[PDB]
Design a protein around this motif. Structure first.
Motif, PDB file in Angstrom:
ATOM      1  N   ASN A 271       0.808  -1.230   0.000  1.00 52.54           N
ATOM      2  CA  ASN A 271       0.000   0.000   0.000  1.00 52.54           C
ATOM      3  C   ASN A 271       0.832   1.267   0.000  1.00 52.54           C
ATOM      4  O   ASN A 271       0.529   2.211  -0.751  1.00 52.54           O
ATOM      5  N   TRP A 272       1.834   1.312   0.847  1.00 53.84           N
ATOM      6  CA  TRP A 272       2.745   2.442   0.916  1.00 53.84           C
ATOM      7  C   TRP A 272       4.048   2.041   1.549  1.00 53.84           C
ATOM      8  O   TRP A 272       4.174   0.987   2.186  1.00 53.84           O
ATOM      9  N   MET A 273       5.050   2.889   1.347  1.00 57.27           N
ATOM     10  CA  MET A 273       6.353   2.629   1.859  1.00 57.27           C
ATOM     11  C   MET A 273       7.100   3.934   2.049  1.00 57.27           C
ATOM     12  O   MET A 273       6.853   4.902   1.327  1.00 57.27           O
ATOM     13  N   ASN A 274       7.974   3.959   3.027  1.00 54.01           N
ATOM     14  CA  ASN A 274       8.903   5.061   3.171  1.00 54.01           C
ATOM     15  C   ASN A 274      10.266   4.628   3.666  1.00 54.01           C
ATOM     16  O   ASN A 274      10.462   3.527   4.195  1.00 54.01           O
ATOM     17  N   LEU A 275      11.238   5.519   3.462  1.00 53.59           N
ATOM     18  CA  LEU A 275      12.587   5.351   3.918  1.00 53.59           C
ATOM     19  C   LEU A 275      12.985   6.565   4.744  1.00 53.59           C
ATOM     20  O   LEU A 275      12.636   7.683   4.368  1.00 53.59           O
TER      21      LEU A 275
ATOM     22  N   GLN B 295       9.267   8.500   0.004  1.00 54.17           N
ATOM     23  CA  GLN B 295       7.989   7.855   0.258  1.00 54.17           C
ATOM     24  C   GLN B 295       7.246   7.619  -1.037  1.00 54.17           C
ATOM     25  O   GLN B 295       7.426   8.332  -2.020  1.00 54.17           O
ATOM     26  N   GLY B 296       6.396   6.604  -1.049  1.00 56.66           N
ATOM     27  CA  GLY B 296       5.613   6.303  -2.216  1.00 56.66           C
ATOM     28  C   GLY B 296       4.418   5.448  -1.858  1.00 56.66           C
ATOM     29  O   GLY B 296       4.400   4.841  -0.783  1.00 56.66           O
ATOM     30  N   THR B 297       3.441   5.417  -2.758  1.00 57.12           N
ATOM     31  CA  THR B 297       2.225   4.622  -2.614  1.00 57.12           C
ATOM     32  C   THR B 297       1.987   3.691  -3.799  1.00 57.12           C
ATOM     33  O   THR B 297       0.854   3.223  -3.995  1.00 57.12           O
ATOM     34  N   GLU B 298       3.031   3.465  -4.594  1.00 55.16           N
ATOM     35  CA  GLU B 298       2.994   2.555  -5.734  1.00 55.16           C
ATOM     36  C   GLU B 298       3.544   1.199  -5.293  1.00 55.16           C
ATOM     37  O   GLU B 298       4.521   1.136  -4.531  1.00 55.16           O
ATOM     38  N   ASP B 299       2.925   0.126  -5.759  1.00 53.18           N
ATOM     39  CA  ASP B 299       3.329  -1.209  -5.360  1.00 53.18           C
ATOM     40  C   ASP B 299       4.501  -1.648  -6.221  1.00 53.18           C
ATOM     41  O   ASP B 299       4.356  -2.214  -7.307  1.00 53.18           O
ATOM     42  N   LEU B 300       5.686  -1.372  -5.684  1.00 53.04           N
ATOM     43  CA  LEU B 300       6.932  -1.640  -6.375  1.00 53.04           C
ATOM     44  C   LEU B 300       7.252  -3.100  -6.423  1.00 53.04           C
ATOM     45  O   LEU B 300       8.230  -3.470  -7.099  1.00 53.04           O
TER      46      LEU B 300
END
Ligand SMILES: CNc1nccc(CN(CC2CCNCC2)S(=O)(=O)c2ccc(S(=O)(=O)N(Cc3ccc(Cl)cc3)C3CCCC3)cc2)n1
Length: 149
Positions: free
Chosen positions: A17-21, A32-37
């Motif tokens: 759903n989302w991710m950040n570093l 940060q992003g909300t794309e399913d990498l």
């Protein structure tokens, strides 16, 4: 096999759903992003600030949903530079409740006695290959190309 089918069932029910570093020392958000990498079969791209290369440790938050129960959800990641693996990382989440949404925090620490190449050299030439597993069952393999900006 039943395992092949279960792997595909897990993937079908999975979404990142989302991710950040963050810089682990200072807490400052780097990306940060909300794309399913993690979606397989396409080469994803991400642009990360070049200062990330100066961080001793980076903390990651990865929020995911899973319709399927997993006993031992885990990830293997490889950092490839022009096709050569420079580093391998292993992270374990563990048990996943069916139909849950979960935030997974992990620490990416510098390997001694590695030294980073310049951002200008690395940029566009780094691929992160990520493999999700439930225990020894491979659920998906995905790739992301990194640009340092
Ligand atoms: C010689 N080794 C080397 N050389 C160059 C780069 C790196 C990897 N870098 C991290 C370290 C941090 C500690 N010291 C400095 C570099 S990185 O900054 O290029 C990096 C790479 C991947 C990741 S990641 O695996 O957390 N991730 C990729 C990813 C995460 C999760 C999933 Cl499911 C899929 C892909 C993305 C980075 C952009 C979007 C998020 C974080 C940071 N290692």
């Amino acid at each position: 096999s039943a395992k092949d089918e279960r792997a595909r069932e897990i993937l079908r029910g999975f979404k990142l759903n989302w991710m950040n570093l963050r810089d682990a020392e200072t807490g400052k958000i780097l990306w940060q992003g909300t794309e399913d990498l993690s979606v397989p079969g396409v080469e994803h791209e991400a642009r990360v600030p070049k200062k990330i290369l100066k961080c001793k440790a980076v903390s990651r938050e990865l929020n995911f949903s899973s319709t399927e129960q997993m006993e031992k959800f885990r990830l293997e990641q490889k950092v490839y530079f022009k096709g050569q693996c420079l580093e391998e990382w292993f992270f374990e989440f563990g048990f996943v409740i069916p139909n849950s949404t979960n935030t997974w925090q992990s620490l990416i620490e510098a390997a001694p006695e590695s030294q980073m190449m310049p951002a200008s050299v690395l940029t566009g030439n780094v691929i992160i290959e990520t493999k999700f597993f439930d225990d020894d069952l491979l659920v998906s393999t995905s790739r992301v190309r990194l640009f340092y900006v």
